[PDB]
A and B are shown apart, each in its own frame.
Chain A
Amino acid sequence: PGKATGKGKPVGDKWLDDAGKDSGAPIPDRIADKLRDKEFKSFDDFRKAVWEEVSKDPELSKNLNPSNKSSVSKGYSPFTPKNQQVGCRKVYELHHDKGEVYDMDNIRVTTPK
């Protein structure tokens, strides 16, 4: 278990487009605000909370279509464009930039490719 920490970064409407780029996308600052100091039993529980918070934030979720909205509403990761998928990895991932497990300044949202 662990407490989530860190600040994240300001992001724009199309922030998941950056997840496809070489940096990846940061955890949005608004999400970091919501999860900071919260306790999580595992990285999977933290990941669920990130996507649930994305689903609740009209600005971070507005560029997801209704099918993708359904996914994040359940705390599931949204599906990437087909050309960013590999193997059975078809959804956005949370990678550590590497270094603490729940440090949101150390986590990047990425596509599989």
Chain B
Amino acid sequence: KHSISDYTEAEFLEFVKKIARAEGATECDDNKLVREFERLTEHPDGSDLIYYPRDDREDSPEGIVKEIKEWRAANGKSGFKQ
């Protein structure tokens, strides 16, 4: 898996759950996962989507994935693997 389009939406949601639950192997693995979330999504808010979300959507892995999916689609970017 290299870009977000290599992940199904389920796989990507399980990855956001991992981050949200701090379930990396170590603290530094969590940091790598957050940075990987940033790389994969290309969203300019980066880690703020996880930790400092806008207040007009749900603060949850669901909500984070919804925001990413909608943002990528609306901005002409590729999406999840079917």
Write the residues of chain A forming the contact surface with B, with a CB cutoff of 8 angstroms: 65-68, 70-71, 73-74, 76-79, 81-82, 85, 88, 90-91
Q: Would B47 and A79 count as touching, CB distance under 8 A?
A: yes
Given the known A-B contacts A65-B52, A66-B59, A70-B22, are A82 and B47 also in contact in the complex, defined by CB atoms under 8 Å? yes
Bitwise interface map of B from 55 to 70 toward A, beta carbon under 8 Å scored 1, else 0: 0000110000000000
A-B contact count (CB 8 A): 47
Residue of A nearest to B46 (CB): A82
A85 to B20, CA, bound (A): 19
A78 to B20, CA, bound (A): 11
A79 to B50, CA, bound (A): 9
Q: Would B53 and A65 count as touching, CB distance under 8 A?
A: yes
